[model samples]
Target: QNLKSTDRAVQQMLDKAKREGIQTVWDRYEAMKPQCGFGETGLCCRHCLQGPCRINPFGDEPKVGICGATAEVIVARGLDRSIAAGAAGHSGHAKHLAHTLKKAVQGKAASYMIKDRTKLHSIAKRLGIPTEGQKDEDIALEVAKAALADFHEKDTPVLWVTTVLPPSRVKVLSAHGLIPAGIDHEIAEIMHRTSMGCDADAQNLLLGGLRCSLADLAGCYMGTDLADILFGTPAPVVTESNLGVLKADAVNVAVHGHNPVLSDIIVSVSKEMENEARAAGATGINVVGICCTGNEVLMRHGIPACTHSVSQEMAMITGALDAMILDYQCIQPSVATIAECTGTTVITTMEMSKITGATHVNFAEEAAVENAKQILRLAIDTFKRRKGKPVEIPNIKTKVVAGFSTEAIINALSKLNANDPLKPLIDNVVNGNIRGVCLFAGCNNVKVPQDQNFTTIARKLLKQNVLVVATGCGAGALMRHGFMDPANVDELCGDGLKAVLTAIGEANGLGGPLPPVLHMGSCVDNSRAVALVAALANRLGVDLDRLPVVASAAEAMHEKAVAIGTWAVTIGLPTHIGVLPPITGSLPVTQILTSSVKDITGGYFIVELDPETAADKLLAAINERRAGLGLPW
Candidate 1:
């Protein structure tokens, strides 16, 4: 029995089929359900030559292969491969963007230009790439080359800005030999070492695996550079969220994935398709997004996301979905399966992610508009094919303000400073009531009932006058609930934070927009958050360990989040808090992460499942740290 009820579209189709007496496989699947076993314990792997081993933890002693790979090694190797896959996915996306930049540089691309010239100069300065008086195309060429090379460059430290930790913290990481040198090398090394009969030592396997996690940061920071140059760096922008953002009468097309290249095309062509759709008997075209693609477009274009990842399946269940165009990663195969039950056309664009029983329209940047229009036309035509009443779309939606990065925040501060009659706003927030900041990010999980804990905890911190910044699904939740808006600040914030908001709110009201709850891009942009804290700590003349800041209270965190959080602690950011369910069965893993880790880096991890309790713990830690620094409560 499927959990989702049939929408009007599917009901109409089923009725027609029943009347005509047509048979469908969907009817059979609806009768006998299939199950997935890989999700429960994460033991599915077949990447190497030795074997596709399923080392069950519940099995007897020496839960390993003839190659002497223990459970930890096998588990860590599986995780390492996952990290490699994730890194490659992001890197491949970056490569496409880089190629576009190159084309734009060579005068081959018409729609592209250097949107942020200042960012170009800044990147040039950092990379030692000369740009003074050079043509934009030339500068772009140099920058694009450097960006692409950063992934594979073997000798140099990853070129992205490294978070400046205290000397002791830096020494600890170095002593452990965890400072990754290059992106491709790290990933390649991990695969080579994790192969059967290779590096079977658990600690060594993990050390090499850590490099895979860090190497991805290279791609992320490079993306930040490219984004800054092409899109203008994201500042705090107002947006909406949830499935309700999907237009009922319009030809609604939702792009889902992490890649910005395809989403960028969708954004460009969706406007074109809007006019085309109107010409073809539709009200208009409404282009919304789901998951990270939603975050990407919303942060830059101010368009709202239809839903987060979990809601992607639910969005299709609405059956009002004209077409769900997917790129790469986090796309469920079940999405295509569910689409079979409705009028929705599931279109797979990216080559790596071809779903069964879905229309395949591969995307290439050279013909992006053509590909987008092709997909849009299919959606419009399919909408016309509806046999009965309009499908029921859930009214569930939330308002969110996303698109804040460290550079964006700094740029906002610079603009605010220029407008100030008495010095600058940065001086005000830093020297004034806003004593410190906290980055509360990650997903709302079913593990926490109703998943209202993230919102509750964030609201608690805001009530205490703490400056909270959010990203990814966490930011989406806050924005959907209306916590990040300029207008809400006066109602929700303490006097100190209210003052900060009042000034920023007035600026935004006057068309100079900025908000306190900075929505720093995607999950990977947590690195930007780390960079921001480090930059702020340095600017404030405080050691990173002693800074009046911390990162905390994320629910349903992925491995990327865990890796970043661990590195943050290693960089001496006091403490991080949230539940880690996988490690509950292993006291050694839990203790090493939560307590023993603190002994090495002066910062620790706290596993708190309850949002209220996590909020209390985080707020207390911040206040205690502030007290140590002689700052006001």
Candidate 2:
């Protein structure tokens, strides 16, 4: 069912995979058929070695584990541990960037420098740091110091989290004691609390999950702000995506993983190394991006993209990629296995993350420029390796108008009424030109048909006049599926939204319509979406929960996706998950997450497997919120 008919390009790969006897993620997924039901329902627990135990989802066996842990505790522990993993993914990334910024300012990092002085100064002012008479490096140093301080001992909440959130939203989190004191502290406490017998109350453990998730939120904000200072905030740019962009005559290099530290330099050096590729009998060097790293370069550099997380192997299977470069996070180690078979080199960039069979290219900020050149040289030198091999690139690419940072959106809106920027957008929502804003974020999952939920739900919402914003793999899915094509504004968007986007485009000097969906940024940059929503709530004089906004990760696979979903919930929005999280084994856990969560945090999880059903439910939720505001549909 997931073969080429469902999507033609995927079919070409499926045929090739079968012909060449390639074992892909799809093959492995089929081998894992009827995956463990116990694990699926969150009944399995291996937190302690005393017993790798599981209870019955149907209550047919012992209702508790060896250490007398109930299903509720087990499920809650699973969810919290996942939150810890997700937090580590986000916070660890931020910690690395903060350290990079610190070294760059201190002159210890040669390859890194502050790129956007305007954004750096603006961020400094927003964080309430003094900038008067300070050198650019000094301002950056203080800002980096402040961001780093957020991870260590602190009396109050993390600076990024505290400053970015609207005060009214902070009051809600503060009242619930979910304000994270230190990003590291909360993650540390979660591991401790979920250990042996330290704590087991599902409700209480969930609170810890909320606090840790907010830390993830803090890391997201820090990562975005600091990234903007380092590599310019995103503004609208036209690009193309999908496998069609893979060139036959060019030396193809795919940049993968999460961090931009490596990829940004790689992008810079690829330009200098293009002639080297030509000397090696190739036309030029083509650097295509995949995953969040794709989002990063695509945001600022207008680079074309190949695929998302679940289908990354397919790009290699195209028999075109000479090398795939990675830094860290969200990169499946199995990619090395695929590369080994396909003769495509998988170059692992970070020292901390090295796949056994992958080439290890140690990357540090100090030598980033040189390191980047070395990596590209490898791709250039190996360009002709696949010369005789048959390659198939799907003839499926669409124009993508992306890089709508919150500032860009505001700037675009300001053209309507320069005196008051957000006012016009607000009036549109109130007048129902825009029904509401819905954020589609997170990664693709094997559990759901990859990219199906994202496209389906997106179209449904757009037809109802809901503006769609996306980030991370969700953005990849939409781009690959043609939802981000500007032409879709007429096809998919309701008449009201079409008129709204058209007028906004004309005012901003664009001759044509804006895309139906807006691409915010990478996964860590999900904070941009939060900032947009927070701005809306602040201007409307309402808390976030009261606003007509909702978030859905209908195909969430990454634990960071779950944590980000929790982050959204904590900030007050109903979240929908297509692939059920491993927590339905316990009735209490399920009930608490679904039915009772809104009572606690003004947010709840909607678990719907069917894309149509999920879309229906999400629209109903938006309209419900609108009704609460006494606005007509």
Candidate 3:
């Protein structure tokens, strides 16, 4: 019954699907059994189609590709391309935000304006764009110009990367030649080098991948910064999550996918259309989220998230979702197939990401509000048709206190120590009140029972006093399981952690304790975790590797997750991944990632499939780092 997910709500949806004979992700995954071994091991090569070649994983025939590229080379090239794809994804999201901001400043997109002038000033100052006597629009225009300019290679390094990291960490990356010149340039470089017979050395290809991954980090940072500048920076907000959040009597619109440029506008427009929904014999317009888009609106607007990542189709399976608005990334094409049965109207909004059998609304920033209105009208109509139809919703949800941006976190800590907000956190770590910090990031994989790994690992780590922070679908996983509910702190956290959380909660007037897990933001907001570590390292006068900090993607399933993990390693944090990445096909490549790479960057991957073992290993990694820092563990 729990074959697909640990969350009871998801399990109930699976039950309903089986009873109705409706196929979900689990059934589809089961149909693709005994999958290609070569692809699984990253041994397949189709770079130029001399042939779709594969190296024998058992060390017999076809030791290399048709071009004589060895197994390591093939694996490394595939990995490099993956990192590039991830970098392109995050950079593309950032570029979209930049263009929207530019349009706003140029008086083109009247619907979108500078929502956070404070964040704008901060970002402009950080980018070295002067705001001394400039108007907000002028500073915003310059900021947008600078963001767009960083896409291409320039004489200087990527400012988003260099300026965000601590000075010492930047030098370390520079020493390793890992600092990206520009986000788009490195992505293109990876594509060029990984092309047929361009660069074949396994180590060299991995190094290139590392650089491209750093570009991903820059892109993610830019995305978080630009989004905060456009939408207000996130602060702690109370919300509910899971399938039970759907209102059967309302015009239920679930915003899916990653980019917030459109989703944020949809959230705003939905508010205006509540009366229209009421006119359609519904209670009101209810806007929920799925995937990172859900994360975006949840953090900023206190909107509920219906589902995320692998469980996206499950939201449609609930039979109550009126219209699912998709932007880009992590959206399953099969949702339209499921929609056929559920009577859910699937709306695709991005020109680049259109699905057959789904309504496509061409979204432009200039006409964002109008586009949103059109989409919501469709939802209201859909709700009218589905009205009085019997629906099965899993009456399950959890309280979530999310929106802990780096600024929000520092602000909360400042209440405890005004002169130095980090001092209390640092003091707690040094004294063992907070043993270490673990940032849980990435997506849920179909291979793992959804939320099982995240819940298992986070529970173990929290019991050991690790201050946990989450982003992406990983945040979705934990929050769905109640880790993001402050009321659970006493039950889920150990004495030390509970005490620290209680202190922060009391100081910030939260009454009891903060959520056992802090929700940072979406996948792109992994940049928030980086900012925290950078602040800790700078304050401690050491590099990031020395801090008792680590990151894990317990159930990662995306190319973007791969990029995020690689950059986590690049930034010198002990990173963990529950699912074994395809690179395990080549021992040399695996060894380099798990062992030798640490010599150069002081960060290495710990690959463990068992969530319990993964948590133990992560705890060990934290203790090892604590010993290195001469702190009590």
Candidate 4:
């Protein structure tokens, strides 16, 4: 009843806002109710003009459009479309970064430059670009051009980034017709094929779409090659900032976006602004981030993330933000309307992200620092314009150790003098001492009650000795609830994992350190988790299907999360989650995915709801796999 009442209130607020022509985050929030339909049955085929086919299996023996495509085709097309959409979203961001890097190199964009030259030189060396004795401008120009060209280098394989995956996986991808020619070409092909009266067969459409997404992934990594060189490869770092990071006595600027370009500049300018604020008889400036932009810098620069995508508005409700600067993604136009309720100045930096009620400061790479300071000054001025009583921050902060990249993990384990850290973790699992890993990930949905599902399940799994590796909003929830710290591992985790934590703790006690739940960078870094598992399987001389790993038990997962899960299963890991494909309305589609397809691939998917059920199912699967491997039960 409480859930239903809250849902009703939220819906009513949304309805009221829509009727009043009030554009706010609630409007965007309400708009997603229609998306629930897209989650189930997977019928999004508008490919041909012969029919705008709506596959409704619940009604009668539903059939495809005029083309005699099966349910597999429909589901495949929908999944493929999602992959394409996700690829477009990520690749476009990477392309923008490439262009910005070029401008910064050419001295055209003053707001940006190579922040870390050593890191840049290192990447240049890795990619075989000249960095020795070359002027920074020359190095930058060369690297930037190479990065930008990756999006259009159709004839060549993506140079620097794709090499990180296993050679076998690369071989598999190439063999499956999934190797993307180039970023732009792949996306263009997907859009072209999905057009009306184009590709009518759903299976082919899906395969093409998957290729499009893979192309984007390839491009994004290429773009980040420069970032790795300039920013240093992200590792464990400590930082704190959130709504709680907002200050009544200081100027507050919240930077929100998924891209690191503008957020990195904001970090630099905020430090300068802090000094300027103190000189003006005010406390220092406080700058934090929201969403994945938060994760990007938090992993690299140790900036505390304010919140995730869904919590952006909640940050404003505190009424202490001096200015909210948005670059891209998850920045609702409602932010503009909300700013009108307080002294907060809303600034949109990206050209495509202009908001009606906000100030626009077009960010150019050449003018990076200058534009950042301009925005900082505006925020400082707004801080002085406050008329309401000072707002108090909630005493809800907790310490979390994140910034665990695959590189960082390798370095840490190497330092421990372990012949193979991956093997030991697996060996322990095979011996019945440690259970499999649980990838607790994805966004914090309001529908599931505030942090209840995430925290509850995490604690339950921890108590059962399951190794939980978290990312994105799910990681944030654990941090906020104090489940991420290594010290708490003994209390929260089962005996087996507790023993491993004890070993890690003892090493740390001896002036050595390692995190319990390895933080593998941002959401994109979830790929690293997949890679890690694959590496472990190869080392153990077992196929991925025979492994004891599971993804999260959450519903309404993001497109990227879905793709990763799909790929994980395709690679042979039995994935269990609470959020089943909403094909409950289509038995044939569900059957093909849950049972029939398992024969094609070595893995299958299962859905388990509730903490006890999820844990029991996961533990059972792990033990069953162990038994198959002839390991002790």
Each prediction's RMSD over C-alphas, in Å, is: 5.5, 1.3, 0.8, 4.6
Question: What tens-digit string does per-residue lDDT give for candidate 2 at 530-606?
Answer: 99998888888988888889999978999999999999888889898989899889889888888787987888888
- Displacement of residue 410 (Cα, Å) in model 3 is 0.2
Model 1 clash pairs?
Answer: 398-480, 399-479, 399-480, 400-479, 404-519
TM-score of 4: 0.84
In model 3, the runs with Cα more than 4 Å from the true position are none
Q: For residues 1-633, write the lDDT of model 4, one tens digit per residue.
A: 233112222233334334545554444555667664534566546666765666665556556545775555666666666666666656667777777777777767766667767656765674578876899878878777766666665556654334544556556556667667776666677767666556756445645754665565554455455555445567778766445656678777787866778888888778877778876556888877776677777888877766665556656655677888888765666788878865579999988878897999988777788888898888888877774556545444555677776666655554444677675576568765577777766655544554556666777767766777776666665665666566566567777877765665455452323445656655555555665776776787765667777766353355555554554455555666556554554565456556664654455566665656766766777667778888775
State the weakest 10-residue window (summed lDDT) of model 3: 1-10
Model 3 Cα lDDT, one tens digit per residue, 1-633: 686788898888898899999988889899999789999998999999697999989968888788889999999999999999999999999999999999998999999889999999999998899999999999999999888888988778899999999998889889989999889999999999999989999888898988899899988999999899889999999999999999888888999988889999999999888787888899999999999999999999999999899988888888899999998898989998899999899999888899999999899999999999999999888999887798888999999999999999999999999989999999999989898999999999999999999999999999999999999999999999999999899899999999999999999998889999999999999999999999999999999989899999999999999999999999999999999788978999998888888987888889899999999999999999999998877
Ranking by TM-score: 3, 2, 4, 1
Considering lDDT, where higher is better, how would the candidates rank from best to worst?
3, 2, 1, 4
lDDT of 4: 0.64
My TM-score estimates for the predictions, one after another, are 0.83, 0.98, 0.99, 0.84
Q: Cα lDDT for residue 569, model 4?
A: 52
Better of 2 and 4 by TM-score: 2
> Candidates' lDDT values, in order?
0.65, 0.87, 0.92, 0.64
**Model 4: per-residue Cα lDDT at residue 34:** 62
